Design a protein around this ligand. Structure first.
Ligand SMILES: Nc1ncnc2c1ncn2[C@@H]1O[C@H](CO)[C@@H](O)[C@H]1OP(=O)(O)O
Length: 213
């Protein structure tokens, strides 16, 4: 039988990767410097000034991606079923534009929120065993690009952290913006969670394909 990928997803172009990576780093430098962030450090780490670029020391080495289905070479529940879909096979190798609406930070991860189109949502997995954090929220809400994570954090965390942030915004606990950065308004959501809502959404170009590793 055929070996499936470790995961499927949208792999950003060199140029788009660079643009997003740089905006992520700017965001981390700006946030760590902001009075509102500094004031809440006791809620971010249990340990002065914290350099977030250093804090999120495990970062993608190269091109960035937005994962659809983690398959673990076929071992993950739902993987075979996902891989066999016509839309996945038809879409393999095709170019898409992804809309980034926000950047976020938590004690565990730094990421960018992706808002998928209906066409793109046909490639979002619809599995049997789903998480309770996805509960209530529209499919594809988890979609994101991971920009870094803290030293002992495992893969899958950024998505979890996004859903949590969205479950909060859904609750109306977003609060008034506590500052304005060049790219948009900054929100403090508590328990070390921060979100920049970009005034102007970023568009990144990407290719849908499978990563083996
Ligand atoms: N259960 C899982 N185990 C490992 N990675 C997973 C995963 N579910 C989703 N992923 C995603 O698959 C990619 C490779 O691990 C990562 O983008 C990761 O999401 P993450 O960005 O939130 O870490």
């Amino acid at each position: 039988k055929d070996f499936l990928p470790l995961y499927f997803g949208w792999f950003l172009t060199k140029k788009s990767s660079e643009t997003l990576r740089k905006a992520g780093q700017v965001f981390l430098e700006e946030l760590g410097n902001h009075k509102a962030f500094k004031k809440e450090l006791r809620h971010f780490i249990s340990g002065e000034k914290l350099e977030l670029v250093s804090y999120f020391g495990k970062r993608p080495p190269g091109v960035l991606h937005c994962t659809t289905k983690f398959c673990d070479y076929g071992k993950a529940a739902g993987a075979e079923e996902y891989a066999q879909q016509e839309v996945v096979k038809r879409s393999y190798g095709k170019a898409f534009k992804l809309s980034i609406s926000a950047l976020f930070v938590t004690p565990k991860t730094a990421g960018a929120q992706v808002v998928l189109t209906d066409q793109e949502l046909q490639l979002w997995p619809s599995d049997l065993d789903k998480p309770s954090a996805s509960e209530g929220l529209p499919p594809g809400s988890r979609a994101h690009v991971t920009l870094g994570c803290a030293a002992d954090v495992q893969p899958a965390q950024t998505g979890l952290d996004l859903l949590d942030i969205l479950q909060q915004v859904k609750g109306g606990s977003q609060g008034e913006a506590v500052g304005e950065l060049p790219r948009g308004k900054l929100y403090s959501l508590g328990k070390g969670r921060w979100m920049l809502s970009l005034t102007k959404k970023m568009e990144v170009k990407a290719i849908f394909t499978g990563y083996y590793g």
